[PDB]
């Protein structure tokens, strides 16, 4: 994976260049936000089970998806689905700390669509649950942190298409 710092270094290194004014400005941009990323990560980590619970209650429960025949029916599938939502929240939080989505390509999305397609896991309902996680997270971390987390939630959703 890369973070916002290693991304700038990699871009300079492939050119054989010392960090120029544009590179140093990009690094300053990341350093200026670092404590705000740590604050958002602390809040999410402390509330991670509660964020998933509220998102599930707003987007999936009391529907055909949890009723007999639905993809979230059976305790095994209920548990797999909320485990997946715990993964999306934890990896989106990593990506937000890094200020870079590369961890999502490497550790979340690689073969995920093909796995969902082989098992019959519904992508549309998964994207609705991720959208609920995005909105519940935003309610706790504030609009700025919520929009930044939303970039990474949207990146996961797009990777399922």
Ligand X SMILES: *[C@H](C)[C@H]1C(Cc2[nH]c(Cc3[nH]c(/C=C4\NC(=O)C(CC)=C4C)c(C)c3CCC(=O)O)c(CCC(=O)O)c2C)=NC(=O)[C@@H]1C
For residues 44 and 137, is the Cβ–Cβ distance under 8 A? yes
Binds a second copy by CB under 8 A, chosen from 69, 111, 124, 143: 69
Among 28, 39, 67, 83, the residue binding a second copy under the rule CB under 8 A is: 67
Question: Which CB, 68 or 124, lies closer to a second copy?
Answer: 68
Nearest C-alpha neighbor of 122 from the set 90, 93, 75, 84: 84
Least Cβ distance, residue 140 to another protein (angstroms): 14
Closest C-alpha to 2, from 89, 97, 120, 138: 97
**14 or 32: CB nearest a second copy:** 14
The tokens for 35 are 């404590």
Binding flag, residue 68, a second copy (CB under 8 A) = yes
H-helix segments, 14-98: 21-46, 48-59, 75-98
88 exposure class (CB count in 10 Å sphere: 0-12, 13-18, 19+): buried
Q: Is 124 in the site for a second copy (CB under 8 A)?
A: no
> Among 16, 111, 120, 143, which residue sits at the site for a second copy (rule: CB under 8 A)?
16
- Length of the chain, please? 161
The sign of the CA dihedral 118, 77, 83, 126 is: positive
CB 56 within 8 A of CB 126: no
Examine residue 10 and tell whether it contacts ligand X (CB under 6 A).
Answer: no
Check the annotation: does 67 bind a ligand: no
What residue ranges bind another protein (CB under 8 A)?
A: 1-6, 8-9, 12-13, 16-19, 24, 27-28, 30-32, 34-35, 37-38, 41-42, 44-45, 48-49, 52-53, 56, 74-80, 82-83, 90, 93-94, 97-98, 103, 107
Using CB under 6 A as the criterion, which residues of the chain lie in contact with ligand X when the complex forms? 61-62, 65-66, 71-75, 77-78, 80-81, 84-85, 87, 107-108, 112, 115, 119, 121-122, 125-126, 129
């Amino acid at each position: 994976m890369q973070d916002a710092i290693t991304s700038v270094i990699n871009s300079s290194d492939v050119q054989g260049k010392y960090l120029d004014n544009a590179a140093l400005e990009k690094l300053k941009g990341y350093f200026a936000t670092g404590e705000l990323r740590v604050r958002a990560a602390t809040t999410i980590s402390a509330n991670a089970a509660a964020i998933v619970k509220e998102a599930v209650a707003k987007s999936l429960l009391y529907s055909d998806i949890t009723r007999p025949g639905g993809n979230m029916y059976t305790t095994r599938r209920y548990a797999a689905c909320i485990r997946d939502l715990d993964y999306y929240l934890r990896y989106a939080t990593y990506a937000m700390l890094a200020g870079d989505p590369s961890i999502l390509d490497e550790r979340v999305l690689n073969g995920l669509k093909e796995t969902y397609n082989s098992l019959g896991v519904p992508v549309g309902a998964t994207v609705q649950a991720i959208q609920a996680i995005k909105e519940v997270t935003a309610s706790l971390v504030g609009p700025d942190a919520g929009k930044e987390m939303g970039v990474y939630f949207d990146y996961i959703c797009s990777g399922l298409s």
